[PDB]
Amino acid sequence: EHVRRDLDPNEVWEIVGELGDGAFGKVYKAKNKETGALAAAKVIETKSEEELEDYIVEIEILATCDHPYIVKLLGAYYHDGKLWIMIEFCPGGAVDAIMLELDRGLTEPQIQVVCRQMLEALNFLHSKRIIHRDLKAGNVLMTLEGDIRLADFGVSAKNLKTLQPYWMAPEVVMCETMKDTPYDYKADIWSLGITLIEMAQIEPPHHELNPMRVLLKIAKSDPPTLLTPSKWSVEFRDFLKIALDKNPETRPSAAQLLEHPFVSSITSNKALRELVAEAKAEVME
Amino acid sequence: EHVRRDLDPNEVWEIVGELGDGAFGKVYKAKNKETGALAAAKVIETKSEEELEDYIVEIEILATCDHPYIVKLLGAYYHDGKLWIMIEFCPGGAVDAIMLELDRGLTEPQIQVVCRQMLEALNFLHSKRIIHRDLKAGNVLMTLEGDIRLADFGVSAKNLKTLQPYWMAPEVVMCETMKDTPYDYKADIWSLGITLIEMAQIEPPHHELNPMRVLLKIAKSDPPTLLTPSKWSVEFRDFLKIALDKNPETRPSAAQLLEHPFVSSITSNKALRELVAEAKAEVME
Ligand SMILES: COc1cc2c(Nc3cc(Cl)c(OC)c(Cl)c3)c(C#N)cnc2cc1OCCCN1CCN(C)CC1
Numbered sequence A, B: 001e002h003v004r005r006d007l008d009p010n011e012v013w014e015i016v017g018e019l020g021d022g023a024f025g026k027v028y029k030a031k032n033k034e035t036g037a038l039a040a041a042k043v044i045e046t047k048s049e050e051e052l053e054d055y056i057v058e059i060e061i062l063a064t065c066d067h068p069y070i071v072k073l074l075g076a077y078y079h080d081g082k083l084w085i086m087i088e089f090c091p092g093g094a095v096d097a098i099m100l101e102l103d104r105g106l107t108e109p110q111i112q113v114v115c116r117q118m119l120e121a122l123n124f125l126h127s128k129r130i131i132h133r134d135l136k137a138g139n140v141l142m143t144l145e146g147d148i149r150l151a152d153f154g155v156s157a158k159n160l161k162t163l164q165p166y167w168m169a170p171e172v173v174m175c176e177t178m179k180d181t182p183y184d185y186k187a188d189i190w191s192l193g194i195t196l197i198e199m200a201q202i203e204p205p206h207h208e209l210n211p212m213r214v215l216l217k218i219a220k221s222d223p224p225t226l227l228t229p230s231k232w233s234v235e236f237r238d239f240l241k242i243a244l245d246k247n248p249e250t251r252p253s254a255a256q257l258l259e260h261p262f263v264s265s266i267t268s269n270k271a272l273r274e275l276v277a278e279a280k281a282e283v284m285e
C-alpha cells in the first residue's frame, strides 16, 4: 500500500549513526543522499509474518496521519529482508528526556502549548477514527521551532490489527463497546490528562508503586490530582478535573477540550521554543 | 500437537451423509471402518493460514476437554489440504432443535438435569482455565442415555488464539480484567442463566427485538426474569436471581452454584432420557 519494494532504500538513504537502543528495537539516524534531509529510522529484520504484518498497519497509520503535530513519514521500504521506516528527525527528542536533561518539570505555559497541540492532533486522529492508545511524555517529540510531534503508533497498529448475541454477559457487552465508538477514542483523553500531570511533576501518578499494583490502583483509586494545587492555576486544576473523568461517556472529546480556558487563548509556541533552547544549552554544561 | 498428518483419514473413516448445513460450514455423518463407531465430522478446506491456525486451537481445546458432559474428540486429521475433525455423534442432537421438534419448552425437572450437567462441565472448564464464551441451547447436544454434551468451542478458540501502564484509561484497565481471572470465566455463568430461560420459554430474553438493539438492551436492562413466576419453583427463580448478577465479582462460580437447591438434589437424568424418547417418537408423526 505504502511500502516501496521496487526501489532500494540504500540508493536514497545513508545511515549516520544510532539514536536510541532497547525495548521495541534500535532507532538509527539517517540522511537523504539527494536532498540531505534528516530522518530517524528503523531497519527492522522481518522475523515472523505476524511481526511484519503489524509494522505494515503502523506504516498505513503513519501514511494517513499527515498532520502538523504528528511525526511525518518520509518513506517506507522493503529490500533484502530488511524493512526500512523513515520518519522526519525530531531534533529536540522526547519531552520526558528533556525533563530528565533539565532535571525539572515543564512550566504551566509550556504544558498549555503541549496540551493545545496534542488536543489538535487527537481531534484529527478522532476524525480519521484512529486511537493512539499510548500517550505519554515519551511519545511527544520536539522540533527546534517549539512544536510537538506525536510519535509511536505501535500500540495503535496492534489494537487495530487485532480488531481487523442474546446470551452475551454484560461485562463482555461493555468491552465490545470500549472497542467501539463513542467510547474507544475517549481513552486517549484520560491518557492526555495523565501526560499533563507527568509533565508537571516529571513522573506519572502512582509511580511510587511497582507496575503490578498500578492496574488495580487506576481501577480503585479516585481520579488523580496535582500534588500542590497552589503551584498551578484554577484553569489547569479544572482541565484535569473534567478530562480525568472515570466515566468515558461524560468525559469530553478533544474538540470540546479545545474550548477550555486552559488552551483556548494559546496563540504562541514561544514557551516550547524557550524549552528547546534551554535543553540544548544544558547539553554543553 | 493432536492433528495426525502421517495417517490418511479415509483409511479409518467413511462418510455416510450430511447432518447440518449453513453458518460456520457443513457437518458430515461418518462411521468407523474398523470399530463401526459413529462420528459427526467436519472436512474443512484450509483456505487461509489464519483459518487453519484457529481450528488447531479448537482441536487442542477439544483434546484437553475430556469430560463426560463435553463433546468427545474421536480424532483430528490433515491430508491433501482437507482438515478432518471427528467428534462422537450425539444422536439426540441440539436441545433447541428438540424444543422446535416438540413445539414446547423443557419442563423444570428437565432444565435441572441440563443445569446440573452444564454446571459440572463448566466447573471442569474453569479448572482447565477454558472459557466457552458461546453457551446456548444450540450448543447443548443430547445422547440417548439422557446426558448432555457441551459443543462448539469455536468462540473459545478465537478468544484464546487472539489472547495468545500508568497512562491507561480505567475502562481499558477494566477490559484487561474481563480478559483475565477472576472475571473472564464468570461470563459463561450469565450465559448459562440465559440458556435456562431459553429452555423454559423456547426463546432467549429480548428475542422480540432485532439483534442490533440486543447489545444495548443487555447493557441498560435489569437482569432478565421468567415471564410467569407462578409456573416455576422458588428454587428456579432464586437460581436465576443469583446467577444473573450484572456484577461479575459478586456473581457465583459453577462450583458455588452446584450447592444451590435447584441442582444439589439431582441424582437422576431420567427426565432427559424421557425427553429424548418423546422427541424420537415425535419424528415418526
Ligand atoms: C531518541 O532518538 C530519536 C528518535 C526519533 C524518533 N523515533 C522513532 C520512533 C519509532 Cl517507533 C520509529 O519507528 C516507527 C522511528 Cl522510524 C523513529 C522519531 C520518530 N518517529 C522522530 N525523531 C526522533 C529523533 C530522535 O533523536 C533526537 C534526540 C536528540 N537528543 C539526543 C540526546 N541529547 C543530548 C538531546 C536530545
Ligand SMILES: COc1cc2c(Nc3cc(Cl)c(OC)c(Cl)c3)c(C#N)cnc2cc1OCCCN1CCN(C)CC1
Pocket (backbone or CB within 6 Å): B019, B020, B027, B040, B041, B042, B071, B085, B086, B087, B088, B089, B090, B091, B092, B093, B094, B141, B151, B152, B153, B154, B283
Ligand atoms: C445437527 O447435526 C449433528 C451435529 C453434531 C455435532 N456437531 C458438530 C459441530 C461442530 Cl462445530 C463440529 O466441528 C468442530 C463437528 Cl466435527 C460436529 C457434534 C459435535 N460436536 C456431535 N454430534 C452431532 C450430531 C448431529 O446430529 C444429530 C441430530 C439428529 N437429528 C436429525 C433431525 N432429527 C429428525 C432428530 C435429530
